């Protein structure tokens, strides 16, 4: 999940 | 028991009930009651039908013992009369078959299960076909409809109201009130 | 297991379980794979089974009939019902059995599901036609006439190696 | 309360019902009833059959007590009479066997199950074959057909209506009306 | 049901049925009935046996009760008499044992199941062997055969009709008709 | 129906049957019957034992109510008398214990099962050992054997005929005929 | 019919049996019988206990009924008296509690199963603790022991024979013979 | 035999037992008994409660037929009175509700389970909430507590001793002794 | 299966089943393996579970608390009981939820077996202490005081993404 | 598992389960594969089984008798009816057993399913013929006359190593 | 699974299931395998188990005592009776527990089979001796005297991290 | 699993399950494989079992006796019935047990199925002979005489490490 | 059901 | 069933 | 069954 | 329960 | 059983 | 049980 | 099975 | 778990 | 099993 | 287990 | 229920 | 099945 996770 | 008491008194009057699927035990009891009430050769018998049907052989025993005696039998259909139930209901003496205004009649085709070797399956197959032909002929004789008409209408399950049954010939007349 | 795969390249097929859809599919797939290979090489089928389903029976029989390479069959321990006609369905002159083999032939068994009599009539007619087809098919694969099978198959019949050889189900018994 | 009362009041008329599969306890009950009614040595005993059959030994006990006594036994078939049922039906006094017009009679061949070692299986096999031959000879004697005719006819199950059973020798005459 | 009063009326004539497998309850009933009928010491007691057998201990209790009283016990076999049934059949008073023409008598050897450690199993094994020896000795004493003849004949199950059982010694005479 | 009036008329003769495994219900029933018959303090009470035993506490209740009353109790064993059964059999009044010639007596050591934590299992273990010692002492007191002899003979199950039981001390005398 | 007859004729002598685990039905029966016998305010009521235990609320209902009536309740314990059984046994009128010489008494701690959320578990936990304290105080009041002595002794199950139960205070006196 | 006799003789004194979970059958029986005893309108009717609760509808039927008649209903609690049981307990005539000293009263708000589509779940949810509010208002009216106080106290299950129940208002007075 | 390991190389851990011994052991082993590498990389835990045991709950929680690397948590679908407290146990400022995510908080449920009164008392005291510790530790990770926490936890409480953000269980909701 | 195959390259075959279709097929496939190599090497089979079906029994017997290579058979622990006849069916002069081995011989046990009396008669005659062939073969493979086998087979018979050696079922007992 | 073996190469052993024959067998198999390498490296055992059989825990304890390398134990999640004794069985100064871990000690429970009262007496003496040996061994690995733990073992006792440290079952509680 | 295979190279065989056909078959298969690898190096057997069948017991015992290299055996945790006799069956002077071992010797138990009394007599004589053989072969491997085994086997007997060493079951107890 | 049955 | 039974 | 039983 | 019920 | 019981 | 109950 | 299959 | 295990 | 099998 | 096994 | 039923 | 499929 980037941004921001990753 | 209260239920035993009320059945005893109603049988004492003239009446016979049938309120469960037809099997050997209930058929034997009804045959015994019919024979017992046959002692008087003048008073008629009354049979109330509310059953979803049962075995063919027991129903035919009841039918034969109904046809045997001189005493006229008057059938009244209440609630549901299906499979052998409607056959017994139509088996009553002509002009003395009745149903309640909300009574519901079901014409049904005989069904059974078979197992075994090929020859046994064969033999039971012709026996079932003969039974079906026997039933169709008896129904055609009783209701006054033509034989091929009956065997065509019995291909699938058919439902009937009181007035539809009266028109079809299953029931002589429908009662409305006392 | 490893021995089955190793014997596979020798064009040897086991039929050691009850006849049903999965086993028939495997057997016919193997038959197609072998015929896709060198079509001038025979295929050996070792039969040890108590029978089973029927559609699998006919499917395997038709697959054996269609394949151009000659297929030989060897009885093994027991061959009953479907296994009997698989064993008798091999190419002429290439049906073998072990000295202590145990062969059984009996008419098909079935259980028609419960229902109204029209369905039972249809199913019974189909069963009778199936039985007629099987008696004709076994008659054309054996020296005995149709009527002899009519007396023989009505009940179960058991034949040994010599009895099967005399009857015509097999062609030769293996000795050593 | 209904069934017991009607069965009692029928038993006072020397009528015995057999409306269930034959096993040990019903056989003992029927034997007791037959012995009880045997006290009067002139009045005949009437027995009604509606059963799909049962155990061999119980049926043979009923048969032996049926032909033990002087009292004539009149058998009436209603509904279904199969396996031991038809044997008891045809075991009645000659000239006194009747069936209802829509009664079905099934000639059936004994069946059983075996278990144990090879010797036990053997011994039970000869015993069962002896029972087969005993039944075949008894029914050939009762019906009037020859032994091999019965043996070939009894290889598979056979069905009979009233009239063909009557002409086959199983039944003396068929009931029509009261 | 009919059973209770029909059995009471038969017992009023000194008649006892054994129509089920032998266990503690039926053995207690039969012993109580034998003791009750033993009040009159000049009338015989009649026992009709139709059973496939049961436990050894209950049968031995019944046998001891039979042997204790001076009232002669007449045993009649109908249908099937096997295991303890035939033992009780042959345990009757000499010259007073009968069977129906189509009765089957099965000479059977005791069987049981054992469980536990290797020491308890031993003790139960000698107890079972002692029971076997006593049964064989009692049968030989009652039938007149020798010990070893009964022992060799009882190794496997054996079947007897009325006549060959009479010849063997199990039955004094065979019933023919009333 | 039948099966209860015989017990009534036997109880009218001061005879008590114990034909089932000993549990709370039968123990309470037998205690009530013993107290009921204790109303007359000069007529003996006869107890017939045929049972494979049961719970310890129920048998002890019966035992205590046997030696509570003045009436002398006479025990007769037929069939099987095992575990609590033989204890009740030997608990009768001295000189008034009897067995039938083919009766079997089994001396059986008490058995049970335990569950729970270590402390609960411990406590139930000493309770079971105390019950063991209690039973051994009572048996030795009744039969006249020493404590060591009884406790060594009761390590495993032991079987006794009528004469072996008489010699050992479990039975005062064995009857042969009336 | 034997059990009902003997229980009725014993109840006519003001004797009540508690011979099964204590539940709602038997508690209601005992309460009804106690109220019925409370019609005469001068004749004492004798209650016999052979029970392995039961529920708490039913036992407390019986205890309250016993304490309410003016009739003295004489308690006799035979066989086993455990859990609620010993509580009812010790709940009798002072000077009128007895046990048989081989009677066995078990002091037990209440046990129950709980389920649900944390709050429900909590609430039922204090309810169980309150019930346990209630029982401990009641039995300490009845026996004469101090609260702390009862709490220490009731931590685990404890067994008592007749004499040591008499010494403890659970039983006022032990009977030997009639 | 015992239970029917004692219940009949207690009902002869206008006493009704409710000693089982409340369902349709017991509710119908209690309604019939209340109507029967309502024939005499100048004598009180006494109702004994020992039950762990039951269905809402049956309890409300009993409640309605309890307050329909002029006869004053005196409720006595023994053992356990929980869920609908305590609701019936507190529904008695004011000034005539009593409990035994060790009786326990459990206040328990209703619980049920639902299944089906979203709309059906919704409808049953408002029906259940309306039933809960109905119960809360009725309890507040009967006990004299404010409605919000009862609602707050009925969020979880609550236990009450006899004296706490008296202080709260569920019970008018406590039976000390006869 | 392949995508699980493929995500695993990117320091992403799924918690998609009920919390029990085996799943907790796997999760803690993965956490230890990830922290065995350079501790300067965050660990992402994706939570979609209806809860489970409490001992395994605590094991995973204090395993997360022990490791130096920051642990971020992202909720998906739902998070109840164990899942909710594990989600709230992430590093501050690194808790995320999806717009349609569901959060459920409820007090622990227990099934204390039959036993003597002393055993029931011991188990009940343990359950009460466990619930008190759980509510205190949850109030530690949330802005709300403990009083509000045990007011709310008495029944079931269900919060959406915005509700969780306002309550303090979630630092920020994922949008796109 | 690895030791099974490793011992298999040494022409050693285990028969450690009950005799049925699958085990018989597997063991005789192994026999055929082993004899596919040089037929001058013996095939050793170790027997430890409580027996099984008679048809698979006969299949294994026939495939042992067919192959040219001599077969070693060694009893190991316990050998029941089918196991006993396999053990006695080895090449003469080269069948051994362990000192504490137990050998058991008993007549076949069968379960004729219920049905028509003609079917039961056919099945009973087949069982009788099968059993008779069994003692005929056993007497052929032993030194005792057929009548002696008839007398000794009517009940269960249990023989030790020395008893089997004296009876002719075993040619030698290995000590160490 | 991969993480288990990967953690294994750093001499870390999980005990996350019930104590029984198979798990214990694997446990001391791994203990011996780690013994196979240099005996100067410690062995770390992470314990999270609700306990189990007594013979298995005794075998693991004996293996731990026999191993010359010092074995350190870390409790986390929960430790029941078997887990408690194994955790306390570590070398002195090397027993740690996580801050929110739960420790439980209770006397052994068993289901003695129904049988002859002599058999029950033998089993009861055996279980009493087993409990005495267990409590003596527990007193060996703790500063508390034997009588104190006999009093404390009669019922269930539950200790937290600080409680276990004060009691003597844990040398130190790790924080971060 | 990997540890079992790794320990296999050092001639260490586990017996951690109940004695039956499959486990025994594996056991003597491994014993024969280790015999083949090297006839001059000992084989170590670690026993932790509650017992099992008797035929498999005797098969393993005979395999141990036939193997030329000595067979080390050590008890681990609990050994009973088959395990006890197998542990006592090791080479003289080289049998060991752990300090907290638990050895149980008990009389054989079985279940004679329902049947005709002649069959029960045959089975009873067979079990008595099995008992006599087992006791004689056990007294052979111990200093105690046969009648001493008669007194000591009639019920269950339990021996610890020192008790087993004194009685003769164990040659030496492993200390550390 | 009168009239007319009964 | 008369006539003639009964 | 007379004669002769009864 | 008199007095006073009944 | 007389004599002598009863 | 008299004496003395009853 | 050679000869002659295969 | 290092430090200090491992 | 050598000698002599194999 | 060395020493001395292995 | 009178009045009025009954 | 060639010819002609495949």
């Amino acid at each position: 999940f980037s941004p921001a996770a990753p | 028991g209260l239920g035993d008491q009320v059945y005893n008194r109603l049988l004492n009057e003239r009446i016979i009930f049938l309120g469960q699927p037809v099997d050997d035990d209930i058929a034997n009891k009804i045959t015994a009651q019919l024979l017992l009430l046959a002692s008087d050769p003048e008073k008629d018998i009354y049979l109330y039908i509310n059953s979803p049907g049962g075995s063919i052989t027991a129903g035919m025993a009841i039918y034969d013992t109904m046809q045997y005696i001189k005493n006229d039998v008057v059938t009244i259909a209440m609630g549901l009369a299906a499979a052998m139930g409607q056959f017994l209901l139509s088996a009553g003496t002509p002009g003395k078959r009745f149903a309640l205004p909300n009574a519901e009649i079901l014409i049904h085709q005989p069904s059974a299960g078979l197992a075994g070797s090929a020859s046994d399956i064969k033999i039971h197959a012709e026996r079932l076909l003969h039974t079906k032909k026997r039933m169709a002929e008896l129904t055609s004789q009783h209701t006054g409809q033509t034989i091929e008409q009956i065997t065509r209408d019995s291909d699938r399950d058919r439902w009937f109201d009181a007035f539809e049954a009266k028109e079809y010939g299953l029931i002589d007349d429908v009662m409305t009130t006392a | 297991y490893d021995p089955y795969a190793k014997l596979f390249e020798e064009r040897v097929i086991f039929l050691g379980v009850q006849i049903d859809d999965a086993s028939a599919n495997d057997v016919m797939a193997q038959l197609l794979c072998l015929e896709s290979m060198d079509p001038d090489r025979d295929i050996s089928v070792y039969i040890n089974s108590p029978g089973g389903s029927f559609t699998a029976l006919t499917a395997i029989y038709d697959t054996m009939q269609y394949v151009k390479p000659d297929v030989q069959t060897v009885c093994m321990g027991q061959a009953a019902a479907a296994a009997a006609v698989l064993l008798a369905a091999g190419t002429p002159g290439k049906r073998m059995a072990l000295p202590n083999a145990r062969v059984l032939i009996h008419q098909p068994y079935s259980e028609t599901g419960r229902g109204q009599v029209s369905d039972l009539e249809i199913a019974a007619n189909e069963i009778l036609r199936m039985r007629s087809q099987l008696e004709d098919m076994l008659a054309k694969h054996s020296t005995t006439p149709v009527e002899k099978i009519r007396e023989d198959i009505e009940r179960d019949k058991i034949l040994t190696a010599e009895d099967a050889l005399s009857y015509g189900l097999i062609d030769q018994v293996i000795s050593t």
Side-chain angles (χ1 to χ4, degrees), chain A, chain B, chain C:
Chain A
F1 285 29
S2 299
Chain B
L2 181 57
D4 286 333
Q5 184 178 2
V6 299
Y7 287 169
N8 261 26
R9 183 177 292 171
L10 273 187
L11 163 70
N12 277 264
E13 182 65 26
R14 296 296 295 163
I15 311 180
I16 298 175
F17 272 97
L18 172 50
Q20 63 255 60
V22 186
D23 61 68
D24 291 331
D25 291 331
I26 180 58
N28 276 278
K29 291 174 71 175
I30 297 169
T31 308
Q33 281 166 95
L34 284 153
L35 282 194
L36 198 58
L37 298 172
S39 296
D40 188 7
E42 294 294 328
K43 293 182 183 293
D44 57 356
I45 313 301
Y46 302 82
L47 183 63
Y48 293 167
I49 304 296
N50 181 6
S51 179
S55 70
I56 300 283
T57 53
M60 294 299 291
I62 300 180
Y63 167 75
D64 285 301
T65 187
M66 293 177 70
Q67 296 294 321
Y68 178 83
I69 62 175
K70 279 73 176 175
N71 292 321
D72 305 336
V73 57
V74 181
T75 63
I76 312 291
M78 64 184 73
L80 180 72
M84 185 63 72
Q86 63 84 30
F87 186 38
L88 292 187
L89 161 73
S90 314
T93 184
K96 292 181 181 179
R97 299 164 298 164
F98 308 100
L100 293 178
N102 300 278
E104 183 178 1
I105 295 92
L106 172 69
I107 294 171
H108 192 66
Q109 184 178 2
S111 71
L114 297 184
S117 161
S119 291
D120 307 335
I121 292 304
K122 184 177 180 180
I123 285 152
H124 295 335
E126 292 84 4
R127 178 46 44 177
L128 267 183
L129 287 165
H130 180 257
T131 297
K132 180 202 170 159
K133 184 178 184 293
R134 179 71 275 172
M135 295 299 102
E137 190 277 331
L138 277 190
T139 295
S140 176
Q141 188 274 331
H142 269 312
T143 72
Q145 302 258 0
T146 301
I147 187 65
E148 69 275 16
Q149 173 73 50
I150 291 295
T151 188
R152 185 179 296 113
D153 281 331
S154 200
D155 203 315
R156 298 274 190 181
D157 305 335
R158 193 164 162 171
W159 292 99
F160 277 94
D161 291 331
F163 290 93
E164 286 173 320
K166 184 177 180 180
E167 182 65 26
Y168 200 66
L170 298 173
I171 291 305
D172 315 305
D173 200 330
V174 57
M175 64 183 73
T176 55
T177 191
Chain C
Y1 189 18
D2 187 25
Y4 281 35
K6 275 189 64 64
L7 293 191
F8 190 50
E9 298 79 22
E10 294 294 328
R11 313 181 88 74
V12 169
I13 288 168
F14 291 100
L15 180 63
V17 298
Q18 288 69 240
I19 317 300
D20 52 352
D21 291 331
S23 191
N25 276 115
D26 280 335
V27 164
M28 64 184 73
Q30 279 153 307
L31 286 153
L32 292 176
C33 183
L34 272 296
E35 61 86 20
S36 66
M37 287 183 211
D38 192 0
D40 298 333
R41 294 178 65 88
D42 303 330
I43 298 169
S44 302
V45 180
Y46 293 163
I47 300 177
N48 180 5
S49 178
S53 170
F54 181 76
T55 50
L57 176 61
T58 300
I60 298 187
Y61 168 80
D62 283 288
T63 300
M64 293 177 70
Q65 283 322 111
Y66 183 61
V67 171
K68 300 294 187 291
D70 301 333
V71 54
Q72 65 183 177
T73 63
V74 169
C75 204
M76 185 180 288
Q78 192 207 48
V85 62
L86 273 296
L87 170 74
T91 177
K94 292 181 181 179
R95 308 197 294 261
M96 313 293 168
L98 293 174
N100 295 314
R102 185 266 182 275
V103 190
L104 190 149
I105 45 173
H106 76 91
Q107 76 179 347
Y109 172 87
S110 162
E111 190 276 331
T112 71
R114 65 154 322 278
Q116 65 183 177
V117 298
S118 311
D119 291 331
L120 282 71
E121 174 191 28
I122 291 305
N125 285 15
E126 179 66 8
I127 288 296
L128 259 59
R129 185 193 63 78
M130 173 186 315
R131 183 177 181 270
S132 174
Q133 192 63 27
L134 261 69
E135 55 190 289
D136 286 332
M137 182 179 72
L138 189 152
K140 67 182 290 294
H141 275 307
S142 296
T143 61
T144 54
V146 182
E147 293 83 3
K148 182 64 69 177
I149 303 170
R150 295 294 86 193
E151 292 84 4
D152 282 328
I153 195 66
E154 194 298 328
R155 298 270 180 194
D156 311 344
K157 198 166 175 176
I158 297 144
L159 294 97
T160 61
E162 321 286 340
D163 297 335
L165 188 138
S166 180
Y167 202 51
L169 302 182
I170 64 168
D171 302 329
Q172 183 62 255
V173 62
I174 297 293
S175 65
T176 50

